Design a protein around this ligand. Structure first.
Ligand SMILES: [Pb+2]
Lengths: 15, 15, 15
């Protein structure tokens, strides 16, 4: 969930 | 696998 | 570590 949380944050910004 | 897929999408959108 | 490194590169790139 830590890695997924960081991916979520990147997605929030980029996507 | 699912997280790799999402990382690939992010990378593609930067590249 | 491979996926974490790729996340780190994305985090660095958009900063
Ligand atoms: Pb890159």
């Amino acid at each position: 969930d830590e890695l997924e949380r960081r991916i979520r944050e990147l997605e929030a910004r980029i996507k």
